[PDB]
Amino acid sequence: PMKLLKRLGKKIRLAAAFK
């Protein structure tokens, strides 16, 4: 589901921006 992919992507991109 797209709405869940937002929640998934948020953690992924946050970790991406982290470093």
Residue 2 to residue 18: CA distance in whole angstroms = 24
Residue 3 to residue 10: CA distance in whole angstroms = 11
Residue 11 identity (one-letter amino acid) = K
To which residue do tokens 């992507």 refer?
Answer: 9
Q: CA nearest 14: which of 4, 6, 1? A: 6
What are the tokens at 10? 């948020």
Count CB atoms within 10 A of the CB of residue 7. Answer: 10
* CA 2 centroid distance within chain: 12
Strand residue runs (E) in 1-19:
none
Q: Which experimental approach was used here?
A: NMR
What are the tokens at 14? 């946050």
